Design a protein around this ligand. Structure first.
Ligand SMILES: Nc1ncnc2[nH]cnc12
Ligand SMILES: [Ca+2]
Length: 211
């Protein structure tokens, strides 16, 4: 399933790589990290590669996806798993970092804002939130150009026609917003610094710091 993710997501290495790099420059080797909506655990695995000694908690509503996540980690790896929705109470922590990839765009805008507040509450002072996210263009005219650029990647990756059809169907349930609006929502939630680190049209890695 990993091959398909790279066919569907432009600049996979730049965007996931940027998320790992900003965490590695922000938190200690022994950081406590929550992967929020870990899915099959691609972001969690990339963090473990860079941070062998980090304490990782992988959270998702899907037991099936978390089972595929646990398969990526060695039997003796201390990685922990929690079955929970984004809208459920977050784990107590504290955490040095909270990370998410391609999950929070499924939430209503009001629930995104509430989630940002609840994440800041479980972060230590100076702690980091990182999102690798599907973002809306700021105008309907630019959204058409974002869509053409996404399709150009998908077609050039030789994506099976039925897998792109399935992708389009899943995207009817997306509630994306532009990157600058959700970065401002981090500031509104009390993150003292927020920045867009990397972007490829529809996809972006952004971060907020608690202090
Ligand atoms: N709302 C949600 N809660 C948990 N995991 C998710 N993955 C995608 N959407 C999710
Ligand atoms: Ca989606």
């Amino acid at each position: 399933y990993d091959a398909l993710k790279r066919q569907l997501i432009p600049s996979f290495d730049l965007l996931y790589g940027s998320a790992v790099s900003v965490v590695a420059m922000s938190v200690p080797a022994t950081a406590r990290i929550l992967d929020l909506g870990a899915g099959t655990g691609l972001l969690g695995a990339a963090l473990r590669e860079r941070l062998p000694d980090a304490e990782l908690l992988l959270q998702d509503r899907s037991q099936a996806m978390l089972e595929q996540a646990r398969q990526r980690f060695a039997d003796d790896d201390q990685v922990a798993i929690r079955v929970a929705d984004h809208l459920d109470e977050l784990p107590a922590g504290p955490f040095d970092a909270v990370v998410s990839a391609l999950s929070i765009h499924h939430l209503e805008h009001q629930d995104k804002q509430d989630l940002f507040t609840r994440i800041r509450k479980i972060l230590r002072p100076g702690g980091i939130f990182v999102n690798v996210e599907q973002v809306l263009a700021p105008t309907s005219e630019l959204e058409k150009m974002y869509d053409r650029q996404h399709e150009a990647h998908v077609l050039a990756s030789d994506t099976p026609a039925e897998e792109w059809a399935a992708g389009r169907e899943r995207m009817k349930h997306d509630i994306p917003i532009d990157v600058e609006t959700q970065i401002q929502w981090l500031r509104d939630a009390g993150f003292t610094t927020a920045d867009c680190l990397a972007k490829d049209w529809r996809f972006a890695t952004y971060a907020g710091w608690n202090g």
